[PDB]
Amino acid sequence: FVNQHLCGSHLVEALYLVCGERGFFYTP
Amino acid sequence: FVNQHLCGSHLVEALYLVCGERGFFYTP
Amino acid sequence: FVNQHLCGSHLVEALYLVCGERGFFYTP
Amino acid sequence: FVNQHLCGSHLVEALYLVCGERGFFYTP
Amino acid sequence: FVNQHLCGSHLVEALYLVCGERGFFYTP
Amino acid sequence: FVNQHLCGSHLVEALYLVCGERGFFYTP
Amino acid sequence: GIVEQCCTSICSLYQLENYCN
Amino acid sequence: GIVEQCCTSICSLYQLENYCN
Amino acid sequence: GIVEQCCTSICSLYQLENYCN
Amino acid sequence: GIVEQCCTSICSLYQLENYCN
Amino acid sequence: GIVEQCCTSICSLYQLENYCN
Amino acid sequence: GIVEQCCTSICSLYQLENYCN
Ligand SMILES: Cc1cccc(O)c1
Ligand SMILES: Cc1cccc(O)c1
Ligand SMILES: Cc1cccc(O)c1
Numbered sequence: 624f625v626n627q628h629l630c631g632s633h634l635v636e637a638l639y640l641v642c643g644e645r646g647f648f649y650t651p
Numbered sequence: 652f653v654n655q656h657l658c659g660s661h662l663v664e665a666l667y668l669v670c671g672e673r674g675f676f677y678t679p
Numbered sequence: 680f681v682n683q684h685l686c687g688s689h690l691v692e693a694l695y696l697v698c699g700e701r702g703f704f705y706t707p
Numbered sequence: 708f709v710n711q712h713l714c715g716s717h718l719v720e721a722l723y724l725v726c727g728e729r730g731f732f733y734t735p
Numbered sequence: 736f737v738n739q740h741l742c743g744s745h746l747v748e749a750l751y752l753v754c755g756e757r758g759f760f761y762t763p
Numbered sequence: 764f765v766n767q768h769l770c771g772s773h774l775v776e777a778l779y780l781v782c783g784e785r786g787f788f789y790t791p
Numbered sequence: 792g793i794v795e796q797c798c799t800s801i802c803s804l805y806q807l808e809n810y811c812n
Numbered sequence: 813g814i815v816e817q818c819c820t821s822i823c824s825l826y827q828l829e830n831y832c833n
Numbered sequence: 834g835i836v837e838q839c840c841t842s843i844c845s846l847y848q849l850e851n852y853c854n
Numbered sequence: 855g856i857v858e859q860c861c862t863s864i865c866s867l868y869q870l871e872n873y874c875n
Numbered sequence: 876g877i878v879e880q881c882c883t884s885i886c887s888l889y890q891l892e893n894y895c896n
Numbered sequence: 897g898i899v900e901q902c903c904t905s906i907c908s909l910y911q912l913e914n915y916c917n
């Protein structure tokens with residue numbers, strides 16, 4: 624579960640950047 | 652809008668951790 | 680050792696957030 | 708206290724790297 | 736030079752993502 | 764490829780810190 | 792919104808929960 | 813979902829963009 | 834220690850709180 | 855340079871591409 | 876403390892070592 | 897390269913310094 628936790632942390636930062644003004648929902 | 656960008660980056664990381672399995676929504 | 684280094688990096692950020700004013704010691 | 712929060716987040720990451728096996732202590 | 740340090744940390748992460756396989760150069 | 768992507772993200776942050784004024788090139 | 796509420800003044804991990812799904 | 817698709821194999825910023833609002 | 838306990842399996846923020854001052 | 859151009863005012867992921875190899 | 880010493884003015888990786896165990 | 901050397905096994909900040917300008 625740790626491997627996925629680490630990945631998810633990086634996913635949300637990339638989403639923050641790519642989505643910009645649009646924002647996003649993160650559903651693990 | 653730079654300090655705002657920086658703050659948002661840290662808020663997203665914080666929500667990722669506090670919300671856990673629930674997930675969160677980030678709307679700039 | 681890399682896998683643990685990556686994990687530890689995320690651990691200290693979470694500790695920073697959860698401990699708040701209390702602070703913490705990180706001993707790998 | 709927001710800029711202070713942001714700075715501390717980066718200091719913790721920095722200590723994690725510089726201190727290595729020694730570990731560090733973070734006291735706000 | 737602290738806010739500058741903080742901004743640069745986030746720029747590096749951003750270039751890491753946008754540039755991908757191409758790689759990037761960071762010159763303070 | 765994900766494992767390496769995660770590692771690289773941490774590599775560039777460490778390079779940012781260690782290289783300081785010198786800066787760096789990151790070539791994956 | 793979260794930026795207005797948490798980027799001008801610090802938010803506890805508790806106020807942050809208001810933004811969880 | 814995003815974890816299933818992007819933690820298994822790498823996703824470009826274009827693939828990640830599908831998860832935006 | 835923390836690495837042994839939280840890098841093997843996932844730790845909640847409550848479990849992490851044990852490592853605070 | 856990138857700091858002068860992107861730390862005083864925000865840069866789009868596009869302007870950031872100017873710094874890719 | 877580290878915040879007083881390193882958040883008002885930048886600290887070298889060397890001054891940061893003062894906070895290692 | 898850096899990924900080949902430092903993602904396989906751990907690199908100290910001194911080893912990383914080889915990749916600086
Ligand atoms: C998720 C959460 C919220 C508040 C305090 C904690 O220790 C953990
Ligand atoms: C750990 C450390 C301190 C200072 C310089 C370096 O390259 C590495
Ligand atoms: C790499 C990149 C640049 C700009 C927009 C994107 O979605 C992705």
Ligand SMILES: Cc1cccc(O)c1
Pocket residue numbers: 658661662665709712797798800801802803
């Ligand atoms: C935890 C956190 C991050 C960024 C801003 C805040 O108010 C709080």
Ligand SMILES: Cc1cccc(O)c1
Pocket residue numbers: 630633634637752765768818819821822823824
């Ligand atoms: C940007 C990024 C982070 C984590 C996983 C991925 O597939 C891609």
Ligand SMILES: Cc1cccc(O)c1
Pocket residue numbers: 625628668686689690693839840842843844845
């Ligand atoms: C928050 C977090 C980071 C790294 C490992 C864990 O078990 C939990």
Ligand SMILES: Cc1cccc(O)c1
Pocket residue numbers: 653656742745746749860861863864865866
């Ligand atoms: C994406 C990003 C990070 C830091 C500063 C900027 O202008 C833009």
Ligand SMILES: Cc1cccc(O)c1
Pocket residue numbers: 714717718721737740881882884885886887
């Ligand atoms: C390396 C670092 C991070 C944050 C503040 C500083 O003064 C220095």
Ligand SMILES: Cc1cccc(O)c1
Pocket residue numbers: 681684724770773774777902903905906907908
């Ligand atoms: C600091 C660091 C990050 C990633 C891999 C390494 O070997 C070392």
Ligand SMILES: [Cl-]
Pocket residue numbers: 629630685686769770
């Ligand atoms: Cl990771």
Ligand SMILES: [Cl-]
Pocket residue numbers: 657658713714741742
């Ligand atoms: Cl910041």
Ligand SMILES: [Zn+2]
Pocket residue numbers: 629632633685688689769772773
């Ligand atoms: Zn990571």
Ligand SMILES: [Zn+2]
Pocket residue numbers: 657660661713716717741744745
């Ligand atoms: Zn930051």
